[PDB]
Short mmCIF file of C-alpha atoms in Angstrom, two decimals:
data_model
loop_
_atom_site.label_atom_id
_atom_site.label_comp_id
_atom_site.label_asym_id
_atom_site.label_seq_id
_atom_site.Cartn_x
_atom_site.Cartn_y
_atom_site.Cartn_z
CA UNK A 1 -0.34 0.08 0.26
CA UNK A 2 2.67 2.57 0.91
CA UNK A 3 5.42 2.58 -1.76
CA UNK A 4 7.65 4.67 0.48
CA UNK A 5 8.98 4.40 4.38
CA UNK A 6 8.95 7.44 7.16
CA UNK A 7 12.41 8.57 7.08
CA UNK A 8 12.96 10.14 10.15
CA UNK A 9 16.98 10.85 10.35
CA UNK A 10 18.60 8.20 12.18
CA UNK A 11 15.38 5.64 12.06
CA UNK A 12 13.26 4.58 9.39
CA UNK A 13 9.63 3.81 10.32
CA UNK A 14 7.91 1.23 7.63
CA UNK A 15 4.54 1.82 7.09
CA UNK A 16 3.41 -1.59 5.65
CA UNK A 17 4.47 -4.05 8.46
CA UNK A 18 2.69 -3.05 11.51
CA UNK A 19 0.70 -0.48 13.44
CA UNK A 20 3.13 2.61 14.44
CA UNK A 21 2.47 2.78 18.14
CA UNK A 22 3.08 6.64 19.50
CA UNK A 23 3.61 6.64 23.00
CA UNK A 24 2.25 9.86 25.25
CA UNK A 25 5.35 11.59 27.06
CA UNK A 26 3.57 14.66 29.11
CA UNK A 27 6.29 17.12 31.24
CA UNK A 28 5.74 16.77 34.69
CA UNK A 29 6.92 20.10 35.62
CA UNK A 30 9.50 20.60 39.00
CA UNK A 31 7.83 22.65 41.60
CA UNK A 32 11.55 25.03 41.82
CA UNK A 33 12.61 25.28 38.06
CA UNK A 34 11.64 26.74 34.93
CA UNK A 35 13.16 23.54 33.27
CA UNK A 36 15.91 21.14 32.73
CA UNK A 37 16.08 20.03 36.33
CA UNK A 38 17.01 16.15 37.16
CA UNK A 39 13.61 15.06 38.71
CA UNK A 40 11.86 16.56 35.70
CA UNK A 41 13.98 15.25 32.92
CA UNK A 42 14.91 11.63 34.77
CA UNK A 43 10.88 11.15 35.14
CA UNK A 44 10.54 11.88 31.31
CA UNK A 45 13.51 9.41 30.58
CA UNK A 46 12.52 6.71 33.07
CA UNK A 47 8.90 7.06 31.05
CA UNK A 48 10.28 7.26 27.71
CA UNK A 49 11.85 3.67 28.74
CA UNK A 50 8.96 2.08 29.76
CA UNK A 51 7.29 2.93 26.96
CA UNK A 52 10.35 1.84 24.89
CA UNK A 53 10.23 -1.83 26.58
CA UNK A 54 6.24 -2.41 26.18
CA UNK A 55 6.25 -1.81 22.85
CA UNK A 56 6.58 2.33 21.67
CA UNK A 57 7.97 2.85 18.31
CA UNK A 58 8.00 6.73 19.09
CA UNK A 59 7.93 9.26 22.01
CA UNK A 60 5.91 11.86 21.58
CA UNK A 61 7.18 14.80 23.94
CA UNK A 62 4.69 17.82 25.43
CA UNK A 63 5.40 20.60 27.19
CA UNK A 64 3.07 22.82 29.04
CA UNK A 65 1.37 24.64 26.81
CA UNK A 66 0.27 21.96 24.50
CA UNK A 67 -2.49 19.32 25.80
CA UNK A 68 -4.11 17.94 27.84
CA UNK A 69 -3.30 21.05 30.10
CA UNK A 70 -3.03 24.29 27.36
CA UNK A 71 -1.20 26.26 29.96
CA UNK A 72 -0.84 29.71 28.48
CA UNK A 73 3.18 30.27 28.90
CA UNK A 74 5.54 32.21 26.64
CA UNK A 75 8.50 30.63 23.68
CA UNK A 76 11.32 31.32 25.47
CA UNK A 77 9.56 29.69 28.88
CA UNK A 78 8.29 26.34 27.07
CA UNK A 79 11.99 26.14 25.41
CA UNK A 80 13.49 26.01 28.86
CA UNK A 81 11.69 23.24 29.85
CA UNK A 82 11.19 21.07 26.42
CA UNK A 83 14.78 21.12 24.93
CA UNK A 84 16.20 19.22 27.80
CA UNK A 85 13.85 16.60 27.48
CA UNK A 86 14.26 15.81 23.82
CA UNK A 87 18.13 15.90 24.84
CA UNK A 88 17.97 13.39 27.42
CA UNK A 89 15.55 11.40 25.78
CA UNK A 90 16.37 11.70 22.02
CA UNK A 91 20.30 10.08 23.85
CA UNK A 92 18.94 7.68 26.08
CA UNK A 93 15.75 5.97 23.95
CA UNK A 94 16.81 5.04 20.74
CA UNK A 95 13.64 5.84 19.10
CA UNK A 96 12.33 8.78 16.90
CA UNK A 97 10.65 11.60 18.65
CA UNK A 98 7.91 13.62 17.93
CA UNK A 99 7.44 17.12 19.33
CA UNK A 100 3.82 17.93 20.03
CA UNK A 101 3.53 21.85 19.24
CA UNK A 102 1.61 24.77 17.12
CA UNK A 103 4.43 27.30 17.38
CA UNK A 104 6.92 27.65 14.62
CA UNK A 105 10.13 28.40 17.35
CA UNK A 106 9.29 25.56 19.84
CA UNK A 107 9.41 23.17 17.39
CA UNK A 108 12.64 24.54 15.26
CA UNK A 109 14.23 24.72 18.61
CA UNK A 110 13.27 20.56 19.39
CA UNK A 111 14.23 19.65 16.11
CA UNK A 112 17.67 21.07 17.01
CA UNK A 113 17.68 19.37 19.91
CA UNK A 114 16.81 16.37 18.33
CA UNK A 115 13.56 15.93 17.62
CA UNK A 116 12.69 13.91 14.45
CA UNK A 117 8.44 14.79 14.10
CA UNK A 118 6.98 17.81 14.61
CA UNK A 119 2.87 16.93 15.79
CA UNK A 120 0.84 19.80 15.26
CA UNK A 121 -2.80 20.58 17.34
CA UNK A 122 -3.53 23.25 14.33
CA UNK A 123 -2.52 22.17 11.42
CA UNK A 124 -0.04 24.34 10.33
CA UNK A 125 -3.39 26.94 10.90
CA UNK A 126 -1.86 28.78 14.42
CA UNK A 127 1.51 29.49 12.92
CA UNK A 128 1.93 28.56 9.47
CA UNK A 129 5.70 29.35 9.57
CA UNK A 130 5.66 25.92 11.59
CA UNK A 131 5.42 23.98 7.55
CA UNK A 132 8.45 26.69 6.51
CA UNK A 133 10.67 24.99 9.71
CA UNK A 134 9.06 21.45 8.48
CA UNK A 135 10.27 22.00 5.07
CA UNK A 136 13.91 23.23 5.79
CA UNK A 137 14.71 20.45 8.01
CA UNK A 138 13.04 17.96 5.91
CA UNK A 139 10.77 16.42 8.67
CA UNK A 140 7.95 14.54 9.11
CA UNK A 141 4.85 16.52 9.92
CA UNK A 142 1.50 15.49 11.70
CA UNK A 143 -1.52 17.67 10.63
CA UNK A 144 -4.75 17.91 12.98
CA UNK A 145 -7.84 18.62 12.36
CA UNK A 146 -9.00 21.52 14.21
CA UNK A 147 -11.29 24.39 14.20
CA UNK A 148 -12.60 27.60 15.83
CA UNK A 149 -16.27 27.14 15.48
CA UNK A 150 -18.52 23.79 15.83
CA UNK A 151 -21.25 24.43 12.93
CA UNK A 152 -20.54 22.02 10.40
CA UNK A 153 -22.86 21.87 7.37
CA UNK A 154 -21.65 18.21 6.71
CA UNK A 155 -19.26 17.04 9.30
CA UNK A 156 -16.97 14.43 7.03
CA UNK A 157 -16.81 16.60 3.83
CA UNK A 158 -16.14 19.46 6.30
CA UNK A 159 -12.85 17.65 7.64
CA UNK A 160 -11.68 16.67 4.66
CA UNK A 161 -12.05 20.01 3.33
CA UNK A 162 -10.23 21.28 6.51
CA UNK A 163 -7.35 18.88 6.07
CA UNK A 164 -7.14 19.74 3.03
CA UNK A 165 -6.22 24.07 3.29
CA UNK A 166 -3.75 22.61 5.98
CA UNK A 167 -1.90 20.11 3.12
CA UNK A 168 -2.02 22.72 0.59
CA UNK A 169 -0.33 25.40 3.61
CA UNK A 170 2.14 22.61 3.82
CA UNK A 171 3.23 21.85 0.18
CA UNK A 172 3.18 25.28 -0.64
CA UNK A 173 5.87 25.95 2.12
CA UNK A 174 7.93 23.09 0.32
CA UNK A 175 6.57 19.66 2.70
CA UNK A 176 7.22 16.94 0.35
CA UNK A 177 4.21 14.37 -0.07
CA UNK A 178 6.31 11.71 1.77
CA UNK A 179 6.50 14.34 5.09
CA UNK A 180 2.86 14.69 5.39
CA UNK A 181 1.01 12.98 8.06
CA UNK A 182 -2.73 13.58 8.70
CA UNK A 183 -5.17 13.10 11.97
CA UNK A 184 -8.94 13.49 12.57
CA UNK A 185 -8.33 15.48 15.52
CA UNK A 186 -11.03 13.56 17.84
CA UNK A 187 -11.83 15.45 20.84
CA UNK A 188 -10.97 18.62 18.96
CA UNK A 189 -13.58 21.03 17.73
CA UNK A 190 -16.37 18.08 18.32
CA UNK A 191 -19.48 17.11 20.50
CA UNK A 192 -19.54 14.01 21.70
CA UNK A 193 -21.51 13.12 18.94
CA UNK A 194 -19.30 14.34 16.52
CA UNK A 195 -16.45 12.38 17.84
CA UNK A 196 -18.40 8.87 17.00
CA UNK A 197 -19.47 10.29 13.76
CA UNK A 198 -15.77 10.20 12.98
CA UNK A 199 -14.95 7.35 14.16
CA UNK A 200 -17.68 5.82 12.14
CA UNK A 201 -16.57 7.19 8.80
CA UNK A 202 -12.50 7.38 9.31
CA UNK A 203 -12.09 5.34 6.42
CA UNK A 204 -13.17 8.61 4.58
CA UNK A 205 -9.83 10.25 5.14
CA UNK A 206 -8.24 7.77 3.01
CA UNK A 207 -9.15 9.31 0.11
CA UNK A 208 -6.49 12.24 0.67
CA UNK A 209 -3.78 9.51 0.34
CA UNK A 210 -1.44 10.35 3.23
CA UNK A 211 -0.91 7.75 6.37
CA UNK A 212 -3.21 8.89 8.95
CA UNK A 213 -2.90 8.65 12.94
CA UNK A 214 -5.49 8.56 15.22
CA UNK A 215 -5.56 10.42 19.19
CA UNK A 216 -8.32 9.03 21.49
CA UNK A 217 -6.65 7.54 23.94
CA UNK A 218 -8.31 8.38 27.22
CA UNK A 219 -10.46 11.13 25.52
CA UNK A 220 -13.82 12.53 27.37
CA UNK A 221 -16.04 11.12 24.73
CA UNK A 222 -15.05 7.83 25.98
CA UNK A 223 -15.85 8.83 29.47
CA UNK A 224 -19.18 9.89 27.80
CA UNK A 225 -20.26 6.24 26.17
CA UNK A 226 -19.65 4.91 29.22
CA UNK A 227 -20.17 6.79 32.08
CA UNK A 228 -16.26 6.22 33.51
CA UNK A 229 -13.96 8.78 34.76
CA UNK A 230 -10.03 9.13 33.04
CA UNK A 231 -7.93 6.20 34.96
CA UNK A 232 -11.04 3.60 33.62
CA UNK A 233 -10.92 4.98 30.07
CA UNK A 234 -8.22 1.54 28.77
CA UNK A 235 -11.41 -0.13 27.14
CA UNK A 236 -13.02 2.23 25.94
CA UNK A 237 -9.49 3.43 24.47
CA UNK A 238 -8.55 -0.05 23.34
CA UNK A 239 -12.05 -0.27 20.73
CA UNK A 240 -10.81 2.98 19.40
CA UNK A 241 -7.78 1.81 18.64
CA UNK A 242 -9.07 -0.92 16.86
CA UNK A 243 -11.81 0.11 14.96
CA UNK A 244 -9.21 2.74 13.89
CA UNK A 245 -6.62 0.02 12.15
CA UNK A 246 -9.58 -1.67 10.56
CA UNK A 247 -10.15 1.59 9.27
CA UNK A 248 -6.57 1.91 8.22
CA UNK A 249 -4.87 4.03 10.17
CA UNK A 250 -1.13 3.81 10.27
CA UNK A 251 -0.14 5.19 13.65
CA UNK A 252 -2.41 5.11 17.16
CA UNK A 253 -1.02 8.20 19.74
CA UNK A 254 -1.88 6.03 22.86
CA UNK A 255 -0.97 6.42 26.70
CA UNK A 256 -0.92 3.43 27.90
CA UNK A 257 1.45 1.19 25.77
CA UNK A 258 1.50 -2.33 26.51
CA UNK A 259 -2.00 -2.69 26.32
CA UNK A 260 -2.30 -0.93 23.10
CA UNK A 261 0.57 -2.93 21.57
CA UNK A 262 -0.76 -5.59 22.15
CA UNK A 263 -4.72 -5.02 20.83
CA UNK A 264 -2.77 -3.58 17.70
CA UNK A 265 -0.59 -6.57 17.18
CA UNK A 266 -3.69 -8.83 17.22
CA UNK A 267 -5.40 -6.43 15.00
CA UNK A 268 -2.46 -6.43 12.82
CA UNK A 269 -2.29 -9.98 12.08
CA UNK A 270 -6.27 -9.99 11.62
CA UNK A 271 -6.20 -7.90 9.15
CA UNK A 272 -3.61 -8.77 7.48
CA UNK A 273 -0.64 -6.05 7.99
CA UNK B 1 -32.11 -4.94 11.06
CA UNK B 2 -33.91 -7.95 13.27
CA UNK B 3 -37.38 -7.92 13.01
CA UNK B 4 -37.80 -10.35 16.51
CA UNK B 5 -36.55 -10.99 19.72
CA UNK B 6 -34.77 -13.96 21.10
CA UNK B 7 -37.23 -15.22 23.54
CA UNK B 8 -36.34 -17.09 26.11
CA UNK B 9 -39.29 -18.48 28.68
CA UNK B 10 -39.34 -15.24 31.36
CA UNK B 11 -36.60 -13.09 29.72
CA UNK B 12 -36.39 -11.49 26.41
CA UNK B 13 -33.71 -10.27 24.22
CA UNK B 14 -33.42 -7.42 22.12
CA UNK B 15 -31.28 -8.12 18.87
CA UNK B 16 -31.37 -4.52 17.50
CA UNK B 17 -29.94 -2.03 21.00
CA UNK B 18 -26.54 -3.64 21.93
CA UNK B 19 -23.92 -6.75 21.35
CA UNK B 20 -24.89 -9.41 23.53
CA UNK B 21 -22.49 -10.59 26.23
CA UNK B 22 -21.96 -14.18 27.25
CA UNK B 23 -20.41 -14.93 30.49
CA UNK B 24 -18.46 -18.25 30.11
CA UNK B 25 -18.84 -20.68 34.19
CA UNK B 26 -17.07 -23.24 33.74
CA UNK B 27 -17.97 -26.25 36.62
CA UNK B 28 -15.11 -26.56 39.29
CA UNK B 29 -15.97 -30.06 40.95
CA UNK B 30 -15.36 -31.00 44.41
CA UNK B 31 -12.62 -33.35 45.53
CA UNK B 32 -15.39 -35.85 47.04
CA UNK B 33 -18.48 -35.59 45.16
CA UNK B 34 -20.03 -36.75 42.30
CA UNK B 35 -21.97 -33.41 42.01
CA UNK B 36 -24.16 -30.91 43.78
CA UNK B 37 -22.02 -29.90 46.67
CA UNK B 38 -22.09 -26.79 48.57
CA UNK B 39 -18.81 -25.47 47.66
CA UNK B 40 -18.88 -26.82 44.08
CA UNK B 41 -22.66 -24.82 43.49
CA UNK B 42 -21.53 -21.80 45.63
CA UNK B 43 -18.55 -21.50 43.31
CA UNK B 44 -20.47 -21.12 40.56
CA UNK B 45 -23.93 -18.91 42.13
CA UNK B 46 -20.88 -16.42 42.90
CA UNK B 47 -18.79 -15.98 39.88
CA UNK B 48 -23.07 -16.30 38.16
CA UNK B 49 -23.73 -12.92 40.27
CA UNK B 50 -20.64 -11.64 39.92
CA UNK B 51 -20.59 -12.01 35.88
CA UNK B 52 -24.08 -10.34 36.36
CA UNK B 53 -22.69 -7.47 38.30
CA UNK B 54 -20.33 -6.29 35.19
CA UNK B 55 -22.58 -6.81 32.48
CA UNK B 56 -23.41 -10.50 31.81
CA UNK B 57 -26.91 -10.90 29.48
CA UNK B 58 -26.38 -14.59 29.48
CA UNK B 59 -24.98 -17.20 31.55
CA UNK B 60 -23.22 -19.98 29.80
CA UNK B 61 -23.15 -22.91 32.04
CA UNK B 62 -20.57 -26.23 31.55
CA UNK B 63 -20.19 -29.51 32.92
CA UNK B 64 -17.12 -31.36 32.79
CA UNK B 65 -17.69 -33.24 28.85
CA UNK B 66 -17.20 -29.71 27.55
CA UNK B 67 -14.43 -27.28 26.62
CA UNK B 68 -12.10 -27.04 27.61
CA UNK B 69 -11.46 -29.97 29.63
CA UNK B 70 -13.03 -32.17 27.46
CA UNK B 71 -13.43 -35.06 30.32
CA UNK B 72 -14.53 -38.40 29.22
CA UNK B 73 -18.15 -38.70 31.35
CA UNK B 74 -21.43 -40.54 30.86
CA UNK B 75 -24.70 -38.76 30.73
CA UNK B 76 -25.45 -40.06 34.03
CA UNK B 77 -22.55 -37.95 36.07
CA UNK B 78 -22.67 -35.28 33.69
CA UNK B 79 -26.35 -34.59 34.81
CA UNK B 80 -25.13 -34.96 38.85
CA UNK B 81 -23.08 -32.09 38.47
CA UNK B 82 -24.96 -29.91 35.78
CA UNK B 83 -28.60 -30.34 37.02
CA UNK B 84 -27.53 -28.25 40.57
CA UNK B 85 -26.06 -25.64 39.33
CA UNK B 86 -28.13 -24.96 36.69
CA UNK B 87 -30.85 -25.23 39.43
CA UNK B 88 -29.10 -22.49 41.90
CA UNK B 89 -28.28 -20.20 39.08
CA UNK B 90 -31.58 -19.99 37.54
CA UNK B 91 -32.96 -19.16 40.72
CA UNK B 92 -30.31 -16.40 41.93
CA UNK B 93 -29.47 -15.17 39.55
CA UNK B 94 -32.01 -13.28 36.86
CA UNK B 95 -30.66 -13.98 33.42
CA UNK B 96 -30.95 -15.96 30.53
CA UNK B 97 -28.73 -19.54 30.99
CA UNK B 98 -27.27 -21.55 28.37
CA UNK B 99 -26.13 -25.19 28.77
CA UNK B 100 -22.79 -25.97 26.61
CA UNK B 101 -23.52 -29.26 25.48
CA UNK B 102 -23.77 -31.86 22.80
CA UNK B 103 -25.68 -34.66 23.91
CA UNK B 104 -29.32 -33.90 23.40
CA UNK B 105 -29.83 -36.34 27.13
CA UNK B 106 -27.63 -33.20 29.23
CA UNK B 107 -29.43 -30.38 27.17
CA UNK B 108 -32.71 -32.14 28.06
CA UNK B 109 -32.39 -32.66 31.79
CA UNK B 110 -30.64 -28.89 31.52
CA UNK B 111 -33.65 -27.24 30.29
CA UNK B 112 -36.13 -29.10 32.66
CA UNK B 113 -33.55 -28.11 35.80
CA UNK B 114 -33.92 -24.13 34.19
CA UNK B 115 -32.25 -23.51 31.40
CA UNK B 116 -33.00 -21.58 28.36
CA UNK B 117 -30.58 -21.82 25.74
CA UNK B 118 -28.72 -24.64 23.73
CA UNK B 119 -25.08 -23.76 23.02
CA UNK B 120 -23.95 -27.06 20.78
CA UNK B 121 -20.20 -27.02 19.65
CA UNK B 122 -20.89 -29.98 17.10
CA UNK B 123 -24.25 -28.09 15.69
CA UNK B 124 -26.42 -30.63 16.17
CA UNK B 125 -24.24 -33.15 13.86
CA UNK B 126 -22.40 -35.34 16.91
CA UNK B 127 -26.44 -36.26 18.41
CA UNK B 128 -28.63 -35.30 15.87
CA UNK B 129 -31.90 -35.47 18.83
CA UNK B 130 -30.13 -32.64 20.60
CA UNK B 131 -32.41 -30.45 17.72
CA UNK B 132 -36.16 -32.47 18.57
CA UNK B 133 -34.98 -31.52 21.93
CA UNK B 134 -34.80 -27.77 20.78
CA UNK B 135 -37.64 -28.07 18.98
CA UNK B 136 -39.74 -29.75 21.56
CA UNK B 137 -38.98 -26.80 24.45
CA UNK B 138 -39.29 -24.12 22.35
CA UNK B 139 -35.50 -22.81 23.02
CA UNK B 140 -33.22 -20.89 20.73
CA UNK B 141 -30.11 -23.11 19.85
CA UNK B 142 -26.62 -22.03 19.09
CA UNK B 143 -24.86 -24.50 16.04
CA UNK B 144 -21.10 -24.17 16.24
CA UNK B 145 -19.07 -24.66 13.31
CA UNK B 146 -17.14 -28.13 13.90
CA UNK B 147 -15.62 -30.67 11.88
CA UNK B 148 -13.76 -34.24 12.18
CA UNK B 149 -10.88 -32.83 9.59
CA UNK B 150 -9.15 -29.66 8.64
CA UNK B 151 -8.30 -30.56 4.94
CA UNK B 152 -10.48 -26.92 3.54
CA UNK B 153 -11.18 -26.81 -0.32
CA UNK B 154 -12.09 -22.99 0.40
CA UNK B 155 -12.41 -22.30 3.89
CA UNK B 156 -14.87 -19.83 4.19
CA UNK B 157 -16.98 -21.69 1.72
CA UNK B 158 -17.07 -24.65 3.20
CA UNK B 159 -17.45 -23.04 6.99
CA UNK B 160 -20.56 -21.81 5.13
CA UNK B 161 -22.05 -25.31 3.78
CA UNK B 162 -21.27 -27.44 7.07
CA UNK B 163 -23.11 -24.48 9.06
CA UNK B 164 -25.86 -24.82 6.19
CA UNK B 165 -25.65 -28.75 6.49
CA UNK B 166 -26.51 -27.91 10.93
CA UNK B 167 -29.47 -25.55 9.83
CA UNK B 168 -30.65 -28.48 7.78
CA UNK B 169 -30.72 -30.58 10.41
CA UNK B 170 -31.90 -28.43 12.99
CA UNK B 171 -35.23 -26.97 10.30
CA UNK B 172 -36.09 -30.78 9.52
CA UNK B 173 -36.18 -31.37 13.67
CA UNK B 174 -38.72 -28.36 13.58
CA UNK B 175 -36.78 -25.63 15.51
CA UNK B 176 -37.81 -22.09 14.47
CA UNK B 177 -35.85 -19.80 12.03
CA UNK B 178 -35.84 -17.38 14.84
CA UNK B 179 -34.63 -19.75 17.40
CA UNK B 180 -31.10 -20.38 15.51
CA UNK B 181 -28.04 -19.05 16.17
CA UNK B 182 -24.38 -20.04 14.04
CA UNK B 183 -21.04 -19.60 15.87
CA UNK B 184 -17.65 -19.63 13.56
CA UNK B 185 -16.16 -21.97 15.95
CA UNK B 186 -12.98 -20.23 16.34
CA UNK B 187 -10.40 -22.50 17.78
CA UNK B 188 -12.27 -26.01 16.45
CA UNK B 189 -10.68 -27.65 13.31
CA UNK B 190 -8.52 -25.22 12.13
CA UNK B 191 -5.13 -24.17 11.69
CA UNK B 192 -3.97 -20.41 13.95
CA UNK B 193 -3.94 -19.48 10.23
CA UNK B 194 -7.43 -20.76 9.07
CA UNK B 195 -8.72 -18.95 12.65
CA UNK B 196 -6.81 -15.82 11.00
CA UNK B 197 -8.59 -16.25 8.33
CA UNK B 198 -12.13 -16.75 9.25
CA UNK B 199 -12.00 -13.91 11.46
CA UNK B 200 -10.86 -11.33 8.63
CA UNK B 201 -13.63 -12.57 6.56
CA UNK B 202 -16.54 -13.28 9.28
CA UNK B 203 -19.08 -10.81 7.64
CA UNK B 204 -19.57 -13.25 4.86
CA UNK B 205 -21.54 -15.66 7.90
CA UNK B 206 -24.32 -12.90 7.62
CA UNK B 207 -25.72 -13.91 4.28
CA UNK B 208 -26.94 -16.82 6.04
CA UNK B 209 -29.43 -14.42 7.90
CA UNK B 210 -29.53 -15.71 11.34
CA UNK B 211 -27.57 -14.12 14.50
CA UNK B 212 -24.36 -14.61 15.11
CA UNK B 213 -22.11 -15.46 18.36
CA UNK B 214 -18.49 -15.01 18.50
CA UNK B 215 -16.73 -17.17 20.88
CA UNK B 216 -12.69 -16.46 20.82
CA UNK B 217 -12.29 -15.68 24.51
CA UNK B 218 -8.43 -16.83 25.69
CA UNK B 219 -8.36 -19.41 22.31
CA UNK B 220 -4.81 -20.37 21.67
CA UNK B 221 -4.52 -18.77 18.27
CA UNK B 222 -4.43 -15.38 20.50
CA UNK B 223 -1.15 -16.84 22.12
CA UNK B 224 0.27 -17.88 18.55
CA UNK B 225 -0.10 -14.70 17.71
CA UNK B 226 1.01 -12.67 20.49
CA UNK B 227 3.68 -14.89 22.21
CA UNK B 228 1.36 -15.13 25.44
CA UNK B 229 0.11 -17.58 28.44
CA UNK B 230 -3.69 -18.24 28.97
CA UNK B 231 -3.87 -15.83 31.49
CA UNK B 232 -2.32 -12.81 29.37
CA UNK B 233 -4.70 -12.93 26.46
CA UNK B 234 -7.28 -10.12 27.49
CA UNK B 235 -6.14 -7.39 25.21
CA UNK B 236 -5.74 -10.11 22.19
CA UNK B 237 -9.62 -11.13 22.96
CA UNK B 238 -10.62 -7.29 22.94
CA UNK B 239 -9.34 -7.37 19.52
CA UNK B 240 -11.29 -10.28 18.45
CA UNK B 241 -14.58 -8.83 20.09
CA UNK B 242 -13.75 -5.56 18.28
CA UNK B 243 -13.51 -6.83 14.78
CA UNK B 244 -16.36 -9.11 15.79
CA UNK B 245 -18.91 -6.76 16.29
CA UNK B 246 -17.57 -4.44 13.75
CA UNK B 247 -18.27 -7.47 11.43
CA UNK B 248 -22.11 -7.56 12.84
CA UNK B 249 -22.00 -10.31 15.74
CA UNK B 250 -24.62 -10.09 17.90
CA UNK B 251 -23.42 -11.86 20.94
CA UNK B 252 -19.76 -12.79 22.35
CA UNK B 253 -18.90 -15.59 24.82
CA UNK B 254 -16.04 -14.38 26.82
CA UNK B 255 -14.63 -14.60 30.41
CA UNK B 256 -13.71 -11.50 31.11
CA UNK B 257 -17.04 -10.26 31.22
CA UNK B 258 -16.27 -6.41 32.80
CA UNK B 259 -13.21 -5.60 30.47
CA UNK B 260 -15.38 -7.21 26.87
CA UNK B 261 -18.30 -5.00 28.63
CA UNK B 262 -17.24 -2.28 28.29
CA UNK B 263 -14.96 -2.76 25.14
CA UNK B 264 -18.63 -3.90 23.44
CA UNK B 265 -20.86 -0.60 25.24
CA UNK B 266 -17.96 1.42 23.23
CA UNK B 267 -17.26 -0.77 19.94
CA UNK B 268 -21.98 -0.56 19.72
CA UNK B 269 -21.56 3.34 20.09
CA UNK B 270 -19.44 3.74 17.52
CA UNK B 271 -20.57 1.96 14.79
CA UNK B 272 -24.49 3.12 15.75
CA UNK B 273 -25.99 -0.23 17.23
#
């Protein structure tokens, strides 16, 4: 199905052999520092090593300004916390690293510090310069579906058009087709029922001809269906992962790496991936 | 999709609202009795109550002569162990009960003791009289795909023909169309790779026009794909359950009721069941 591999500097990800597992690493900030402190960075490194041992193929690193917390923090402050984490994790864990940011300067510094992939929740629409950064370093970029409003004429048709507007911003900046990945942005600018409709119709995203990453891990729409708190959504998340793989996704972005890796491996064998 | 409900005596199962969860109860025999002993029966009752509390819609009860153990035991001995369990569980737990047996006399005594459904791993081919029993009591019967040999010309085509031969045995005995359920018999008369092929093509079974039950829980083909022992197959089983629901199954037969109920409920909401 894919006539190329995802090239991530020193690493190469085959898109045909197996579903790729992206483990989520969120910063746990230390109370008396701006970043780079032993306890904070050691926590990150230890969690990245655990995710590696349980099946992760990519480690996704997020500072304070991104999900789930969305803290208002300047670029300078975000770089102080994020750069040390990327430096240590990239040296100590032999997997590609993704930087989860919509800010062009954060992405640039992150790539300089050793990151391999840009993961953008605004799909180059918040800061179009992130696509120039991506084109310059020749790195993969994930463009997520996102929106300021929630009035859809036709949810799936509108998502595809919005993602297309992202792809045009990326291409115009010189990002190569082989460096583009799409994400339906489940849990963003969508009601619970729109989240369910997007899951039901995910295979439609395949028509754009790019690899798709699914990120549903522990999201509130699962709690909504199940009536369960965030620490009790492992099974709900597993269901979304299985359906996503069935509908043709190439990556899943997950917190519970051990459990989701097993579920993905079983799915792969049944669908004949 | 279904223009009728499954009628189980005092209970009625709607086939359209949700995937139906069948919890597996296997006998744990007491060392100094033939059956009916407090410890043995109390264990059964307590496990049936736990499965009920975590989401089971049907309790499936199996004696020593059935899976997983396949002990060689006479009909008289099997009735001594199974009948007391059905009597206590049916009185104390308000759910339909399925008897897992291929023996016509076991099924008859089980129904007399309070069972509502016959679950036959030989699909009325081992003892054709089981279909006369089913027709007489007007109870649902599950006909599983099974075979003495393993030389398939075309696995799916052959499974459908074999299931059809079962349906003909049932109809000829007077079993009504609304009382027939089919099961692909994953883990029976199939190599690991044939088990994977059947999962991949499960939707083909829908052409026969009967409800389908899937029973994959903890099976060796999961261990084969994952390289994991029987107590570590929860995630592998969940994957089979999700794909099965996606491919249109109406029931799943599972050991891990709490976890599979959550996974089924999430799937139902995404597919729009």
